[PDB]
């Protein structure tokens, strides 16, 4: 009953940000020290909680959301931020209680000649609500004329590849991101520190 | 691993039709695209047509609009070029190509790189 944070952080494969993965963590002992003492993480930002105090707290559920974005977009995984990722791909609530953790994954997620398998949503009729997920591939109407599912003038495919090459600048290198959300409801608190 | 195998082409009289087929093994092109290119002697390899694999929207070089049609059969994992109203200057080696890259604007497939190529198929357009 050790919380399976390994399965999330050390997953072989990570989701595209538009198709971000969520794992519900419950009914286990969480050793948060494995995370906050790690030298592996380039970002470790907590909101409404102190990372070192986490081993002292109990929650009903922990949600672990994970995906890949480029380095220069990690700043968008924060309450109240704007940009293509926060607006159209993965949106934190203004009142977020949790931690945003990221690390450079250039060694796994970049390939010589480019890895283009990680996508982001470039076009959308409106901003995502917090923790909304949109995996639709409907043709996006950018102009006054309906597309009727046909790409053309002002009628676009809504997703686009990141082009991750190991020689990219750090800003265009792939980062793996895990967002931990800490939920306290009127129920037994099933995820506690040691 | 990934093979693009062309069939069809060869000799046809001007105003006639040919159909090129390109059978893909070892990959599907999902949200990216397949295309056709051609190379005449002394000339750079030039874009002919692209198709979004998932949704099937097509993009054409101006030089073949109203004459050539690109299409694909997901079940057969095959892309096609229907070449109608053949012109003498359509004579070239035709290549099918596959892109690894998902681009939002289909017109990007006229200029962005393709990582997978067929063997090349001679098309020759003859007089009377
Ligand atoms: C991921 O694996 C590494 C190497 O085994 C280990 O040091 C680390 O603690 C693991 N992460 C988690 C959260 O268990």
Author numbering:
A (entry chain EEE): 334 to 527
B (entry chain FFF): 1 to 128
Sentences from the paper on this structure:
H11-A10 and H11-H6 are identical, but H11-B5 has a unique arrangement for R27 to F29. This void is filled by F29, which alters the structure of CDR1 but maintains the structure of CDR3. CDR1 of H11, H11-D4, and H11-H4 makes essentially no contact with RBD; while in H11-H6, H11-A10, and H11-B5, the residue T31 forms hydrogen bonds with R52 of the RBD. H11-H6 has a notably slower off rate than H11-A10 and H11-B5 despite similar free energy of binding and the salt bridge π–cation arrangement. In H11-H6, W112 adopts a nonfavored rotamer, due to its interaction with the side chain of I101. We suggest that the slow off rate may reflect the reorganization of I101 and W112 (relative to the parent H11) that has occurred on binding.
Recognition of the RBD by the nanobodies is dominated by CDR3 and CDR2, with CDR1 only making a few contacts. At the heart of the interaction of these nanobodies with the RBD is a salt bridge π–cation interaction involving R52 from CDR2 of the nanobody and E484 and F490 of the virus RBD. As a result of binding to this epitope, the nanobody directly competes with the binding of angiotensin-converting enzyme 2 (ACE2) and thus is neutralizing.
